[PDB]
Ligand SMILES: CCCCCCCCCCCC(=O)OC[C@H](COP(=O)(O)OCCN)OC(=O)CCCCCCCCC
Ligand SMILES: CCCCCCCCCCCC(=O)OC[C@H](COP(=O)(O)OCCN)OC(=O)CCCCCCCCC
Ligand SMILES: CCCCCCCCCCCC(=O)OC[C@H](COP(=O)(O)OCCN)OC(=O)CCCCCCCCC
Ligand SMILES: CCCCCCCCCCCC(=O)OC[C@H](COP(=O)(O)OCCN)OC(=O)CCCCCCCCC
Ligand SMILES: CC(C)Oc1cc(Cl)ccc1CNc1cc(-c2ccccc2)nc2ncnn12
Ligand SMILES: CC(C)Oc1cc(Cl)ccc1CNc1cc(-c2ccccc2)nc2ncnn12
Ligand SMILES: CCCCCCCCCCCCCCCCCCCCCCCCO
Ligand SMILES: CCCCCCCCCCCCCCCCCCCCCCCCO
Ligand SMILES: CCCCCCCC/C=C\CCCCCCCC(=O)NCCO
Ligand SMILES: CCCCCCCC/C=C\CCCCCCCC(=O)NCCO
Ligand SMILES: CCCCCCCCCCCCCCCCCCCCO
């Protein structure tokens with residue numbers, strides 16, 4: 043399953059702040075807390091629609107200008123067009139529909155603050171473990187598989203298919219402090235490395 | 239494994255020639271026999287380098303102008319740059335590094351004449367069966383797995399990692415007649431569905 | 434003149450009582466809430482029903498051979514216990530198969546084929562339990578006096594060997610399934626897998642092995658000493674498979 | 688000399704000679720060509736070595752009980768046959784797990800961990816064969832009396848039961864391994880799997896089942912009648928696993 047050696051922060055020379063700033067400059071967005079979603083687009087298995095609806099709901103809020111979103115995936119062309127429209131409407135949203143090499147994914151995990159996994163059902167949860175190994179705080183649905191990996195001290199838990207609750211969780215995570223973020227990242231690394 | 243209800247010619251509307259011409263126009267190349275390679279790029283498992291070397295060798299031949307090549311894959315950036323340089327040098331070569339949906343893959347299988355599978359080791363060979371189901375004549379290495387599927391009457395067989403033999407096989411396949419191509423497509427469909 | 438109960442008979446009666454209580458609780462919880470209708474819950478409910486049948490059979494058999502003197506009522510209950518144990522092991526195998534396919538068929542598991550597969554598994558499990566738990570009734574028992582009686586009195590030697598052969602085949606299948614679950618997961622997960630498989634093995638190998646090395650003339654004590662861990666397994670199944678779920682627990686706390 | 692061989696022993700000596708000839712040819716082909724050094728060929732050569740040992744053991748055993756009166760040699764040569772059969776049944780499991788891992792780990796199977804795995808599997812197979820073919824020459828022997836000889840005279844009854852238990856555990860693993868290969872493949876590729884598994888079950892079930900339902904007082908004809916199919920399983924192994932390969936055929940038409 044998890045290599046535990048392919049995924050590690052040691053392979054990345056740059057620091058968290060420097061890597062995040064470089065990645066944001068590459069995408070042409072200013073510095074700030076960024077949330078990344080990776081996975082295929084589909085009706086009711088991965089759940090990109092819930093994330094997009096939550097983003098739309100948050101758009102009416104003033105603090106939405108402080109949040110950056112990176113969406114990676116493919117699938118139904120309607121959802122791809124919806125994501126492209128959201129990207130065009132707001133300058134703090136980016137969409138990457140192309141495939142990415144494992145090195146790029148590893149670099150991303152070590153740069154983005156939070157990884158959103160709002161899946162309807164996910165028996166095992168490789169994505170959560172891979173993100174946690176590089177100190178990425180997850181925000182996942184409380185379904186089987188993700189419930190075991192993520193405890194109260196290693197991330198957040200949200201009800202499946204509840205855009206309002208997902209938006210509330212994002213807003214609440216917006217206030218976490220840098221020291222708390224570092225402690226959470228260390229705890230996530232420990233949980234991912236110890237858990238098989 | 240293979241989904242017989244997913245890979246079929248029924249889901250395609252136009253005729254073989256019409257789909258081929260439309261795809262070639264979309265890719266901006268003239269009508270002709272087109273050879274497609276789909277797979278990962280790497281050193282010694284799928285052998286894209288063998289196909290690229292064969293194309294380079296064939297470039298010096300006069301008949302090379304009648305061949306079209308579509309290369310789909312990802313991997314070592316050096317090989318990607320080599321493929322891009324080959325595409326730039328010759329107007330009858332195209333490279334697609336993007337990931338494609340299964341519908342596009344089936345359309346390609348139903349459009350291109352020949353599918354090249356010069357892999358060093360293919361224990362099962364899903365690509366061969368998927369290409370055959372839509373009526374694409376394969377040109378595969380004679381390694382385990384591909385040898386079981388492709389008989390003498392359903393395609394060609396070439397020695398693994400021998401660019402000269404691959405070029406010779408491509409040249410030989412360039413001269414097959416339309417009726418022979420139709421018979422080969424029917425035989426390939428029968429063999430693929432039989433499994 | 435009813436026979437005098439022994440200490441081991443009382444021990445098995447109380448073990449049956451405890452098993453019945455636990456699995457009645459589990460079955461009531463699952464059948465009560467209408468949200469528990471996924472294939473996992475169907476398989477766990479089948480396991481709980483099998484264990485409850487085994488426990489109730491133990492209690493009734495003790496009450497049918499020492500209190501309600503009867504020679505025809507204590508023979509049906511042996512078949513009932515054989516059916517219960519066979520169905521319990523079949524349900525364990527079905528649960529393991531479902532878990533492995535859910536971890537492997539990540540995207541195709543959530544379909545109608547999963548429901549059809551679960552129904553097929555339940556049909557196979559209970560049909561096999563009933564086919565291999567009707568032999569004591571008429572097909573194979575040593576009651577007549579010319580069928581080489583086995584270690585468990587009413588049953589036959591040719592029947593208790595087929596049961597052991599089937600158990601060892603199922604055990605091999607379970608080992609292979611756990612190998613492919615270990616490969617997908619891989620030290621907490623592996624430790625938990627090892628514990629869950631070790632409980633099953635340590636509980637069911639004693640009897641099924643003594644079942645092949647024993648005769649009708651061996652001491653009757655070895656029966657009880659090897660057939661008690663099987664009851665203990667039926668006792669600890671709900672804890673492993675039902676009460677460790679995070680949806681059953683909230684209903685428990687209600 | 689004195690025992691005056693019987694009509695059922697010549698039929699077994701000739702089978703031994705045929706098995707020996709076939710597998711000697713296969714081993715000579717494998718060892719002669721230096722290109723055959725992949726893990727597949729190591730496993731298929733181990734299988735051939737095991738079935739050559741079995742055949743030579745049969746021939747020598749027949750020649751040591753009816754031509755060279757010697758109890759010591761016969762006792763030593765029964766253990767050789769037990770080891771040969773154990774190794775020949777372990778090599779099939781090794782081959783099948785290799786096939787499954789090559790079909791599954793399509794890109795990881797060609798790493799350098801497929802050689803360490805093959806060496807580990809060979810060590811396990813030929814260590815288990817020697818551990819479970821060390822019993823006749825060891826404590827678990829029935830020669831001294833009071834140890835309840837099994838269906839095969841020199842061997843004990845606990846040793847044969849342990850061997851049968853191990854076979855049924857290993858038979859279940861093959862069922863799951865083929866149930867996993869069917870999903871990868873899946874009409875003409877399922878028929879071959881069914882035939883290859885039937886040729887193994889139909890050949891080895893008779894003995895391993897009679898091994899549990901039999902006794903020292905059973906007629907001696909059943910041992911011959913159930914141990915002949917087991918011998919004939921070493922005649923079709925080279926055809927299924929060695930002569931059906933195309934490189935091997937190319938080397939053979941010279
Ligand atoms: C998803 C929507 C909800 C649908 C719910 C119905 C599906 C079947 C659930 C059965 C689960 C179970 O606990 O089995 C116990 C009985 C046997 O109990 P017995 O009295 O102790 O023993 C008597 C022996 N039979 O299980 C069975 O009988 C197995 C039934 C097999 C057929 C599967 C259902 C077919 C319906 C289409
Ligand atoms: C996946 C691993 C598990 C594999 C299980 C292997 C066991 C199969 C063998 C069945 C033979 C048997 O014992 O049948 C008993 C009765 C017959 O008793 P009788 O002949 O009537 O006695 C003499 C009468 N005068 O069988 C039946 O009643 C028929 C039902 C057979 C049930 C087998 C179902 C297996 C489904 C998995
Ligand atoms: C890449 C080049 C490879 C070089 C060769 C590697 C050797 C692997 C073994 C070959 C197959 C075989 O039949 O083994 C038989 C021997 C025993 O035969 P015995 O005479 O009938 O019975 C006596 C019982 N031992 O058994 C063994 O192989 C024992 C396991 C050894 C495997 C590890 C070898 C370490 C090499 C580093
Ligand atoms: C996947 C298939 C699983 C196989 C499961 C069966 C395992 C058998 C375990 C214990 C029985 C046994 O091996 O006999 C003990 C031997 C015999 O010695 P002795 O006659 O009792 O000596 C007494 C002297 N007075 O003990 C040994 O010789 C030690 C070797 C044990 C071999 C087990 C190897 C298994 C590797 C797979
Ligand atoms: C020869 C022996 C190990 O066979 C077995 C024994 C048990 Cl107890 C369980 C299972 C099997 C065979 N299944 C198996 C084995 C191995 C493997 C890895 C390393 C060394 C040796 C074997 N890997 C696998 N991956 C998926 N199945 N599987
Ligand atoms: C209950 C019975 C079927 O269990 C088995 C019996 C045998 Cl002979 C072999 C194996 C198994 C369990 N392995 C298994 C079963 C099924 C399955 C598919 C449809 C209906 C029911 C079961 N699919 C699977 N895919 C990978 N393993 N596997
Ligand atoms: C002369 C005959 C002698 C034979 C006697 C044999 C006795 C063998 C002991 C068998 C009884 C012990 C059963 C072990 C079960 C252990 C696991 C506990 C799991 C608890 C849940 C953990 C949840 C996390 O997963
Ligand atoms: C006391 C009575 C008990 C008697 C028990 C007798 C049981 C009968 C056993 C019969 C032995 C033979 C069984 C071989 C069957 C396999 C066919 C050949 C496969 C080889 C070609 C495959 C090529 C493509 O894969
Ligand atoms: C897909 C099919 C699944 C089949 C699995 C087969 C497992 C059967 C193994 C073991 C079943 C053992 C049955 C217990 C014997 C009877 C106990 C008893 O009689 N106690 C009398 C009270 O004194
Ligand atoms: C990973 C370990 C693999 C172990 C697999 C275990 C299989 C053993 C099963 C069966 C082995 C049966 C052995 C034959 C008995 C002896 C035959 C005989 O003695 N004939 C005397 C001539 O008259
Ligand atoms: C799960 C699918 C795999 C194949 C299973 C094959 C069945 C093996 C067990 C046979 C038991 C068959 C035992 C029969 C008992 C015969 C005694 C007759 C009377 C003696 O006088």
Ligand SMILES: CCCCCCCCCCCCCCCCCCCCO
Pocket residue numbers: 631634635638639642643646647648651652
């Ligand atoms: C694998 C994880 C740990 C658990 C393993 C326990 C396995 C022990 C087998 C005990 C066999 C117990 C068989 C005892 C037979 C008693 C003598 C018979 C006398 C006939 O008259």
Ligand SMILES: CCCCCCCCCCCCCCCCCCCCO
Pocket residue numbers: 638642845849852
């Ligand atoms: C691969 C995982 C396997 C788990 C362990 C299997 C153990 C069962 C086999 C029989 C054990 C050994 C049975 C005990 C030996 C019989 C004689 C003892 C009594 C002397 O009077």
Ligand SMILES: CCCCCCCCCCCCCCCCCCCCO
Pocket residue numbers: 885888889892893896897900901902904905
């Ligand atoms: C898929 C192909 C499977 C074919 C094999 C089926 C199983 C054969 C059963 C062997 C019966 C073994 C018969 C035992 C004979 C009676 C011995 C009793 C002696 C009492 O002292």
Ligand SMILES: CCCCCCCCCCCCO
Pocket residue numbers: 440441444
């Ligand atoms: C957890 C297993 C509990 C075993 C309880 C055994 C108690 C037996 C005591 C009475 C035996 C008759 O002398």
Ligand SMILES: CCCCCCCCCCCCO
Pocket residue numbers: 439440441443444447448
């Ligand atoms: C499962 C163990 C708990 C039950 C213990 C019962 C022991 C009773 C043995 C003494 C008999 C008294 O009549």
Ligand SMILES: CCCCCCCCCCCCO
Pocket residue numbers: 546549550553
């Ligand atoms: C003795 C056990 C035999 C098991 C065979 C069951 C195969 C039925 C497949 C049903 C279709 C599953 O989608």
Ligand SMILES: CCCCCCCCCCCCO
Pocket residue numbers: 043612615616619
């Ligand atoms: C015999 C036990 C077989 C299971 C071995 C699996 C565990 C070894 C590490 C596997 C590496 C992940 O693919």
Ligand SMILES: CCCCCCCCCCCCO
Pocket residue numbers: 694697698701702
């Ligand atoms: C593979 C078996 C071939 C048939 C062998 C027949 C031998 C029977 C000999 C019986 C009379 C003694 O010469």
Ligand SMILES: CCCCCCCCCCCCO
Pocket residue numbers: 694695698919
């Ligand atoms: C599968 C091949 C079976 C051929 C050998 C059967 C025995 C034939 C000769 C008769 C020996 C009994 O006197």
Ligand SMILES: CCCCCCCCCCCCO
Pocket residue numbers: 800803804807
């Ligand atoms: C009963 C024998 C089971 C022993 C299994 C040994 C597994 C060792 C793992 C070796 C890892 C090689 O990838």
Ligand SMILES: CCCCCCCCCCCCO
Pocket residue numbers: 239866867869870871873
């Ligand atoms: C009992 C045999 C179990 C395996 C049978 C599976 C055959 C049908 C599977 C078709 C779907 C491929 O993923």
